[PDB]
Amino acid sequence: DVDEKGFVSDKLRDNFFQIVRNRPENRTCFDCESRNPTWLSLSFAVFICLNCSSDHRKMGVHISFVRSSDLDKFTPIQLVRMDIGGNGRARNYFKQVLGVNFSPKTKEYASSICGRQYKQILDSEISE
Ligand SMILES: [Zn+2]
Structure with missing residues (x-):
């Protein structure tokens, strides 16, 4: 199931992300x-x-913690996090809190207090 470092198998990972990436917003x-x-x-x-x-990789992990869904190792809770999140939920949150000129190209959302707040909404979903 899960190796000694706490990582799911490449295969479980593959089966999970193939589905979650195929969700239309993703x-x-x-x-x-x-x-x-x-x-x-x-x-x-x-x-x-x-x-x-x-x-994103130049920003530092406290801003944005970057992985390849194709290649990297994941813990089971990180999969759940991806599952309850997604591009649609995030777009929905940011268009409301950052407004009509929400512009994810600049990654202003990532360093914003609103970014921190959304990160905590997700933490709360996977923890309580
Ligand atoms: Zn891009």
Whole structure:
């Protein structure tokens, strides 16, 4: 099931993300709308492209904690987090709290207090 480092198998991971990536809102990158994104920020439970993933990787884990859904190891709780999150829930939250000019391309959401607040909404879902 789960290895000594606390990671699910590559196969369980594969079966999980193949489904969750196919959810319609998850089929375009959260930041730039590039199609079929396979990278992710665990923090906001959003899927992002290989291009936007590099930008996120320069920000630092407290801002955005980046993994490849294709390649990286995941713990079981990180899968649940991706499952209850997704691009649709995040877009919905941010368009409300950041408004009509919500512009995920700049990743302003990631460093924002609103970003922190959404990250905590997700923490609360997976913890209580
Ligand atoms: Zn992108």
